[PDB]
Design a protein around this ligand. Structure first.
Ligand code: VTT
Ligand code: VTT
Ligand code: VTT
Lengths: 300, 237
């Protein structure tokens, strides 16, 4: 189990750690989060009490370094930093655990939710979507745009998700116009899986990361990416059976975790009704269709 | 974006543009089988691709053999239309290629867009106008060449004859759509109107009769009467 220590909490803030969240009051004696499960990526995120504008946060993996949070009064945000002095880190943290000034990552033993949301998400791949190579952790906020959004404006602050565009020469083989537009298997299997992602694990990792950025930061371009990646599979007649079964599990846990009150802005009615009721894979997502119909029947 | 009555004179500016109408591409008769089921028999069709400024009509005749062994023909017909329009554009010198293609049915937008990805500078546009181009097969010399075809064929027609010698493109297009609206609302009446007087002929090199300027005003009035009239008989007013 690992620890993310806080210099202090000078401004009132709601702090998220993965799917959990808690309120810290202005100048409250808070010095961080302990008992963080090793083996998974994590996200620590923030929404200030005064300005709910800009949810922001940091993706990290405690196996890759010792990280802490310190408020910056000039830039006005909680910043993640890496402590390279391992002995100092050890000495400073033990004191906060002794003075009991940290919240415990509150995982229920039965609970596989976080694993099931991040199964294919790797820090190395996150760091290629979010380019800032001098840090081992990655900053994301509500406002960041995607490379594809910039093509339709600061390239350094972009989410470099894989561009998916169903009416593009990449997606459509000369002479197979109708075939390739109506059945996206070529684009999914040859262009995307064999050519760009190399395997379905990397595809699912990006799909899961996009969902999590949409849910935790309200990042609109991430929501677009998540739906595009779902639609590309559902609109393919030829999809490996293990991929369809895994996608059904992935989406099931995403839909289960989605806050009920955010469904209207995070779920695209057209994509879900097409995928579940019209697409080639309309009969292949049993778990996802069942939870969607019981939790969000209005959307359908 | 979409073409409507607000931007109607844009059709007659000097940017090359084509209308594409696909309503006569896939044509069938429906009939009973010996077992008392129903079956279709396809007949030859055509793509109606028209330059509204010049009157040049690229009539691609769709021979029934193109449907042999194919499924979901109504969907295929849209993609076949887009394939042939794309092939036509590529066949034209760069300086003759259109800047815009306006489809008369919104269901042609995605098929044409996908086929023209190579041409990102050609705009594919819908229209809100309810243009009567389906009635093109009511023109005698066009229906004849379509029904006689034994193989795929393109014939280049001018649907304005020599009207542009005497009137503007705007007025020619208005006359054309009035004639076609009439043929679509009541084909027999419309055709009676156009051919009643045996001293007004259709030249061997013309599709429509050789009306004087004055006779065209009479004809045009009779067509508006017809369209208003059948706007009565249909709706009882
Ligand atoms: C809060 C904290 C914990 C580990 S290092 C650190 C600090 O203030 N400077 N590194
Ligand atoms: C090309 C052709 C053949 C018979 S009439 C005709 C025509 O378009 N006249 N304007
Ligand atoms: C009878 C008639 C004449 C001009 S439009 C029209 C019609 O039925 N539109 N739906």
């Amino acid at each position: 189990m690992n620890t993310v220590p806080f210099t202090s909490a000078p401004i009132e803030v709601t702090i998220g750690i993965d799917q959990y969240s808690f309120n810290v009051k202005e100048n409250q004696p808070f010095h961080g989060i302990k008992d963080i499960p090793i083996g998974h990526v994590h996200v620590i995120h923030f929404q200030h009490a005064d300005n709910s504008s800009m949810r922001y946060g940091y993706w990290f993996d405690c196996r890759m370094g010792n990280f802490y949070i310190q408020y910056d009064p000039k830039d006005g945000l909680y910043k993640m930093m890496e402590e390279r002095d391992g002995a100092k880190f050890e000495n400073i943290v033990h004191n906060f655990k002794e003075r009991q000034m940290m919240v415990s990552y509150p995982k229920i033993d039965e609970d596989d939710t976080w694993y099931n949301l991040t199964e294919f998400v790797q820090m190395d791949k996150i760091r290629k979507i979010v380019r800032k190579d001098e840090n081992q952790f990655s900053y994301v906020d509500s406002s960041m745009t995607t490379v594809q959004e910039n093509e339709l404006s600061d390239p350094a602050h972009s989410l470099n998700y894989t561009v998916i565009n169903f009416k593009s020469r990449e997606a459509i083989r000369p002479g197979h116009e109708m075939e390739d537009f109506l059945d996206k298997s070529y684009y999914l299997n040859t262009v995307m899986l064999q050519g760009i992602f190399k395997n379905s694990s990397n595809y699912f990792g990006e799909l899961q990361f996009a969902f999590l950025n949409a849910m935790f930061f309200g990042n609109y371009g991430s929501s677009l990416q998540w739906h595009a990646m779902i639609e590309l599979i559902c609109s393919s007649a030829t999809v490996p059976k293990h991929m369809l079964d895994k996608l059904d599990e992935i989406l099931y846990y995403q839909i289960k975790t989605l806050p009920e009150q955010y469904s209207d802005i995070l779920l695209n009615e057209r994509v879900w009704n097409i995928c579940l009721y019209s697409s080639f894979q309309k009969n292949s997502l049993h778990n996802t269709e069942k939870i969607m119909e019981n939790k969000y029947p209005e959307l359908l | 974006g979409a073409m409507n009555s607000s931007n109607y004179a844009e059709l007659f500016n000097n940017d090359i543009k084509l209308f594409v109408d696909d309503t006569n591409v896939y044509r069938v008769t429906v009939h009973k089988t010996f077992e008392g089921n129903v079956a279709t028999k396809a007949i030859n069709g055509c793509i109606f691709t028209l330059n509204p400024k010049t009157g040049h009509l690229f009539l691609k005749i769709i021979h029934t053999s193109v449907w042999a062994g194919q499924k979901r023909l109504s969907q295929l017909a849209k993609w076949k239309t887009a394939e042939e329009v794309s092939a036509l554009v590529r066949s034209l010198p760069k300086e003759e290629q259109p800047k815009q293609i306006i489809v008369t049915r919104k269901a042609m937008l995605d098929p044409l867009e996908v086929h023209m990805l190579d041409f990102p500078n050609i705009a594919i546009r819908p229209t809100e106008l309810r243009l009567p181009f389906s009635a093109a097969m009511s023109i005698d010399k066009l229906s004849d060449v379509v029904m006689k075809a034994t193989e795929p064929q393109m014939v280049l027609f001018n649907i304005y004859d020599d009207w542009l010698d005497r009137i503007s493109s705007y007025t020619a297009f208005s006359r054309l759509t009035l004639l076609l609206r009439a043929l679509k609302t009541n084909e027999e009446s419309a055709k009676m109107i156009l051919l009643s007087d045996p001293t007004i002929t259709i030249k061997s090199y013309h599709l429509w009769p050789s009306f004087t300027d004055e006779q065209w005003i009479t004809i045009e009035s009779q067509m508006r009467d017809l369209i208003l009239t059948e706007y009565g008989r249909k709706y009882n007013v």
